[PDB]
Design a protein around this motif. Structure first.
Motif, PDB file in Angstrom:
ATOM      1  N   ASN D  22     -14.748  -4.052  -3.046  1.00  0.00           N
ATOM      2  CA  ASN D  22     -14.618  -2.941  -3.995  1.00  0.00           C
ATOM      3  C   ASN D  22     -15.065  -1.635  -3.383  1.00  0.00           C
ATOM      4  O   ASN D  22     -15.650  -0.803  -4.058  1.00  0.00           O
ATOM      5  CB  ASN D  22     -15.439  -3.185  -5.268  1.00  0.00           C
ATOM      6  CG  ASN D  22     -15.019  -4.438  -6.000  1.00  0.00           C
ATOM      7  OD1 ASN D  22     -13.872  -4.571  -6.395  1.00  0.00           O
ATOM      8  ND2 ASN D  22     -15.908  -5.404  -6.085  1.00  0.00           N
ATOM      9  N   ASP D 376      -5.542 -12.088 -10.767  1.00  0.00           N
ATOM     10  CA  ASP D 376      -5.077 -11.111  -9.798  1.00  0.00           C
ATOM     11  C   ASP D 376      -6.221 -10.165  -9.465  1.00  0.00           C
ATOM     12  O   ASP D 376      -7.122  -9.959 -10.274  1.00  0.00           O
ATOM     13  CB  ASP D 376      -3.860 -10.354 -10.326  1.00  0.00           C
ATOM     14  CG  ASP D 376      -4.209  -9.348 -11.400  1.00  0.00           C
ATOM     15  OD1 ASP D 376      -4.424  -9.745 -12.574  1.00  0.00           O
ATOM     16  OD2 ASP D 376      -4.171  -8.141 -11.084  1.00  0.00           O
ATOM     17  N   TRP D 377      -6.240  -9.714  -8.214  1.00  0.00           N
ATOM     18  CA  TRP D 377      -7.414  -9.105  -7.593  1.00  0.00           C
ATOM     19  C   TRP D 377      -7.049  -7.755  -6.987  1.00  0.00           C
ATOM     20  O   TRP D 377      -6.692  -7.675  -5.797  1.00  0.00           O
ATOM     21  CB  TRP D 377      -7.929 -10.027  -6.489  1.00  0.00           C
ATOM     22  CG  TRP D 377      -8.436 -11.329  -7.025  1.00  0.00           C
ATOM     23  CD1 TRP D 377      -7.771 -12.516  -7.039  1.00  0.00           C
ATOM     24  CD2 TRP D 377      -9.718 -11.573  -7.635  1.00  0.00           C
ATOM     25  NE1 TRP D 377      -8.556 -13.484  -7.613  1.00  0.00           N
ATOM     26  CE2 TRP D 377      -9.760 -12.939  -7.976  1.00  0.00           C
ATOM     27  CE3 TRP D 377     -10.840 -10.779  -7.892  1.00  0.00           C
ATOM     28  CZ2 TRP D 377     -10.890 -13.538  -8.559  1.00  0.00           C
ATOM     29  CZ3 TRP D 377     -11.975 -11.383  -8.471  1.00  0.00           C
ATOM     30  CH2 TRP D 377     -11.983 -12.747  -8.792  1.00  0.00           C
ATOM     31  N   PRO D 378      -6.895  -6.734  -7.849  1.00  0.00           N
ATOM     32  CA  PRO D 378      -6.492  -5.403  -7.398  1.00  0.00           C
ATOM     33  C   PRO D 378      -7.685  -4.679  -6.771  1.00  0.00           C
ATOM     34  O   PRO D 378      -8.831  -5.090  -6.964  1.00  0.00           O
ATOM     35  CB  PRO D 378      -6.046  -4.721  -8.681  1.00  0.00           C
ATOM     36  CG  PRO D 378      -6.861  -5.355  -9.737  1.00  0.00           C
ATOM     37  CD  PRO D 378      -7.118  -6.779  -9.305  1.00  0.00           C
ATOM     38  N   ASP D 379      -7.412  -3.597  -6.044  1.00  0.00           N
ATOM     39  CA  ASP D 379      -8.460  -2.714  -5.569  1.00  0.00           C
ATOM     40  C   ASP D 379      -9.353  -2.233  -6.718  1.00  0.00           C
ATOM     41  O   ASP D 379     -10.573  -2.226  -6.596  1.00  0.00           O
ATOM     42  CB  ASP D 379      -7.862  -1.513  -4.847  1.00  0.00           C
ATOM     43  CG  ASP D 379      -8.906  -0.470  -4.508  1.00  0.00           C
ATOM     44  OD1 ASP D 379      -9.841  -0.790  -3.736  1.00  0.00           O
ATOM     45  OD2 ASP D 379      -8.821   0.656  -5.058  1.00  0.00           O
ATOM     46  N   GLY D 380      -8.740  -1.706  -7.770  1.00  0.00           N
ATOM     47  CA  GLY D 380      -9.514  -1.289  -8.918  1.00  0.00           C
ATOM     48  C   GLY D 380     -10.104   0.108  -8.874  1.00  0.00           C
ATOM     49  O   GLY D 380     -10.841   0.474  -9.779  1.00  0.00           O
ATOM     50  N   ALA D 381      -9.858   0.875  -7.818  1.00  0.00           N
ATOM     51  CA  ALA D 381     -10.188   2.312  -7.845  1.00  0.00           C
ATOM     52  C   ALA D 381      -9.204   3.120  -8.696  1.00  0.00           C
ATOM     53  O   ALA D 381      -8.049   2.768  -8.852  1.00  0.00           O
ATOM     54  CB  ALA D 381     -10.244   2.896  -6.448  1.00  0.00           C
TER      55      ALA D 381
END
Ligand SMILES: [Ca+2]
Ligand SMILES: [Ca+2]
Ligand SMILES: [Ca+2]
Ligand SMILES: [Ca+2]
Lengths: 387, 387, 387, 387
Positions: D22, D376-381
């Protein structure tokens, strides 16, 4: 057990990038310490960066004025290789505005000088405790190498100068063992003035290329014998002059006298003096600390007409350089000592006026027996982002 | 195995800079913790800085109000020598607003007091786990040394005071072994009032120079015997008065009574009491915690007319000082114990009103048998950059 | 070699401050991570803080929305005792929004759950490598203790619940050895609903005080036998109700049934159930997670009329509390296990609307056989500085 | 002692979240370094994250322009698993804009390339010292794997390419032992063009799935034998094309020729090629580096009609992906090697124009023999907070 200079220098057919911290780039938005006079130094298990902190961060407000050399808020700090010297990772060695440091095989000796210009003193630390203290003899800015010393079977000599910078001064070679003084002796030989010596050792011999601040454009050399504890000095004979500022290269140069033309100024530098396997470093500019290059000048020390046979540009003339000095990893694997060096990349004052500080970053290289292509290795900070 | 005070004090012919963190300078643009009441303390392998955190950074907003001594957000933290006490490198020892700490040779004991003024308690930690708890006996601000204790073959005594600060109080010497209480005993001898003791030990004897807060301008002394577990107290006889505030030095002073002239106030201080090899520290100002100096007053403890024969200024009168206290590296190499001390350099409130916080930095010195030149070692922060 | 629960609980006559990180105070101007659901857990050599990161700093902009429990950017991190969970010092254990962790004597097992609410999975890590994986059985938010498990000769049981939170669900006790599943068994006994169990172990028996989310104001208890690998559940009999929200204490309470009055809500809590040596923790408020206190209620588990005989306020009713849970240092010196606990001090949303985040700090206490005075230990952040 | 590939691949019935840092989320308000081309690599005792720093922080101003690949201020850094690559915790391996790294069991070898496009050189480091240097042979961007190599009884082969990226180039397999060159050999087999190889090893065989940049939408494979020091290359036969950009999946594909349709472009990727136990990774988009998925295509390498039998989405098509590569913990407990991989989640330029930088974060997964639910594993920024 004590390290013993038993190998000789490898063949240097070129130089490879060894280390680079990008501190001023990273320090535009990180907690990096304003420093100067860096160097590199190896323990048996790791090699580190070293410098004199100014006791402030680059973006900190207390950075206004760090063009100044000697103050109460300076210190010798070291940090992991190729990191930037940050507030949270730096280790303090000792308190002072002049230093040198070397591992003897068993543990590390570090020396810091502090004081007013007329009442300074050296405290020799050994294995992280203070052990021995020396006071100004000449009472005019006691000062050392500003780069690592070298040991051999427990004896580690260090060159100090005390006195004028634009005249006759008093230089001593002290010989330490276990942080304690064994002996010391006044400077000998034909060198006229000595400052900031860059030293290395091979086959039980120690060679320092120093700086004549008041006269010489050619560089003095102290050769030291760590077993007999004696020494002698000279100048590099070659006409490829390697101080700064300096006049232009003549076709013939001095072996036992300063080559004249600029007075009362220089910069720290180094060379590796090894028969035909001889390499000198210098700023490309003669006027300014700009650019840096290495030059292969066979028999430079002895041959007073010697001129380059091969070369490598390290920093382009358009990029700011500064001090430089030698080091080697004496505990590296292999049959020979691989020669390394570092260049200080000064940023800020005096040449860059729009900022109120003076800092630097480090590039470090070591030799290869290969013939590697060359790149140039600038600081890479953008002074305008500090405005 | 347990440390044993078997050496004596080296000859102190002057003092050399040992440590200096420049925290408030560095804390103007770094994540340094607001702290106070620092000290230094050595393990067998390293010496560290120590202080009571206020649970906030200097530039943090929660720094408004840290002129306050006792709160829920204070802690004993330590950090590497000459670093600044930062959020990311500090180690918490225990939770409290009063403390002391010492390694016994095998491992370290740390003591923190917390509580409301009328219901405080000490928790003794040993090898980083809590072991023993003590409650207010007098129920008026249970408090300790605010600097390191001293051990001998596993026994480490600690002086606490509980009671009034401007009157008769109850002081106890507790003797700990392995973090457990062996014994304790009420204060004895002629000292009238005891606070914040600064202790050292040599040749199996422990000497604490403490602070009489309600009467004495001359400093009380507890001498402790760690084998018999008894003690006695006195005052330093000399007329060179070393509390603050204080009147001017008379020509003759008290040995068993407080020298009168200021009431209900003082500062933490120390001395090394060693025949003719005796050195006292003090603020230069008599009114204010300003400046700091060391003074050689032979037979100060016993000779009620003794006056200085040599001296060293540590902090100029124009620069703010504060608490001070003794420590020695008991595991250092050598035939004698080299005497060290530290000065707290307070910044902010009360004397510096334009800011809303109160912090400090540390300078630390140790003795030399040499006669070293002297420098002065101010905090070096610029209060105007905090505005 | 594997730890073995061979001692019993020390006598708890009061509680002493053990740990406190002041994170939200320090996080107003430092790089501290938004976290929640903390706990404490000891290795053989050190005790640490633990929490679920939200993958952002408190002052970072990505902190808007961290009132949310389950997301891709959450993780189990641990850090040194009483430090704040910062970006630069935190160690990541595993990736997930629900966890538990315990050292077995040889090395540490850590368990994280991630997933969508209907397709979650647990990954059991052992000695920092993933070893065993379990999938939703009930397919409605697989979840664990949110505080440390307990081992005995290599077997470490863990309670999971999968299913509804406001109804009948499926709870299993898994028994791990070396990170591998030995056995598991459905919940047994009279407890109606189980969530977030707080466990400790003494004399080869493990006691978890859990949370009935849909019915009970009194707390269910699972007692576990780590040698036979069986268990049973019950409710605490006492009328001193210790969930929140809750009705007022009656004069008589349930032993094998939920005491009714609030539905579908609770908080994590704990107790130490030891004959007359029994202490329950609770929020002082019945409506809100406010305040915290410990209460001595002899024979609470078994005696359905038991009422307090002694008490200690930990956090004043005016101060925000939150989750709480048990831990003990099983490798501490001494003849008995000293009981410890922690309280989560939630700050931000929901109760503090003017900010857009939700974080917490930790206070931790352990028992004393002494009768220590009491202080109150609030978070101490000032929500207005975040505006 | 040297590691020896003696186990085989475990059965992969699904994938579990292994690591996730992250960084760009955390780097919005922390001192995180701009990086790209990450990977993961295990020592005997710990697994780490790895990447090429751009010598600046994300919020630092010197981040404008980091869409650029090759410069003087790039470096190979590593950091603790699932932390973000910060200024204060990152360790520098070597200086360069192309790299690979692997532990051989005894210690770690790291390789960095620097230079101008036409005069580049590799420096092989072994046990943190430089040992061997190689120069451009084709003199057009000397480059390596950008992910970890693999060793077997001390021999660790590495694939380099030197030459054109949109044409015939010169690729060599070098075989290193103790950082020294044993042998090297030109590329063999039917593969047309090789870049950025992703390698793993089992049962004394090493398999690299590489990238044909000028022709192939299907991926070339080098199989290496570390004992005989020979190799051969091919293409994956399957019609499930796994480069990007790429045309749509046909019903039949090439085994010894590039499948045509897009020229002069690709991305780093990987596969695990194990009979029916075969899993391929790919971006979901054919046009863009968007989304990521794993697909079970039995006998993909050999069966030119093979199509998926099972799958797992890792990153949704709406979320940005990037490079990916293989690694395994060769020193993990168990009878088989558990297969792992990582995906680089690129943020910034080119696709996200409103910012002037280009960075990434990492998600890492490993196999399970279980059938775990998927998230699902996005960047999230949130790119808007950088404006
Ligand atoms: Ca000169
Ligand atoms: Ca007084
Ligand atoms: Ca409930
Ligand atoms: Ca392609």
């Amino acid at each position: 057990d004590f390290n013993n200079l038993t190998k000789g220098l490898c063949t240097i057919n070129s130089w490879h990038i060894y280390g680079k911290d990008n501190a001023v780039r990273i320090g535009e938005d990180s907690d990096v310490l304003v420093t100067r006079e860096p160097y590199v130094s190896c323990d048996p298990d790791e090699c580190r960066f070293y410098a004199l902190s100014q006791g402030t961060t680059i973006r900190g407000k207390h950075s206004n004025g760090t063009i100044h050399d000697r103050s109460q808020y300076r210190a010798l700090i070291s940090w992991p290789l190729s990191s930037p010297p940050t507030v949270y990772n730096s280790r303090v060695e000792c308190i002072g505005w002049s230093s040198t440091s070397c591992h003897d095989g068993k543990t590390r000796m570090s020396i810091c000088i502090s004081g007013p210009n007329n009442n300074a003193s050296a405290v020799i630390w050994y294995n992280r405790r203070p052990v021995t203290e020396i006071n100004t003899w000449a009472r005019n800015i006691l000062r050392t190498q500003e780069s690592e010393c070298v040991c051999h079977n427990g004896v580690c000599p260090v060159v100090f100068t005390d006195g004028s910078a634009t005249g006759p001064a008093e230089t001593r070679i002290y010989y330490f063992k276990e942080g304690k003084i064994l002996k010391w002796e006044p400077l000998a030989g034909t060198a006229k003035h000595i400052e900031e010596c860059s030293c290395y050792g091979e086959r039980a011999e120690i060679t320092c290329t120093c700086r004549d601040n008041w006269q010489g454009s050619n560089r003095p050399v102290i050769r030291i014998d760590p077993v007999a504890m004696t020494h002698t000095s000279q100048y590099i004979c070659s006409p490829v002059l390697t101080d700064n500022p300096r006049p232009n290269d003549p076709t013939v140069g001095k072996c036992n006298d300063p080559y004249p033309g600029n007075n009362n100024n220089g910069v720290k530098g180094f060379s590796y003096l090894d028969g035909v396997n001889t390499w000198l470093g210098r700023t490309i500019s003669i006027a300014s600390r700009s650019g840096y290059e290495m030059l292969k000048v066979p028999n430079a020390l002895t041959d007073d007409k010697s001129k380059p046979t091969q070369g490598q540009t390290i920093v382009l003339n358009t990029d700011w350089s500064g001090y430089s000095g030698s080091f080697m990893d004496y505990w590296a694997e292999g049959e020979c000592y691989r020669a390394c060096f570092y260049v200080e990349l000064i940023r800020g004052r005096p040449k860059e006026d729009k900022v109120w500080w003076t800092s630097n970053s480090i590039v470090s290289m070591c030799s290869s027996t290969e013939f590697l292509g060359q790149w140039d290795w600038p600081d890479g900070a953008k002074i305008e982002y500090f405005l």
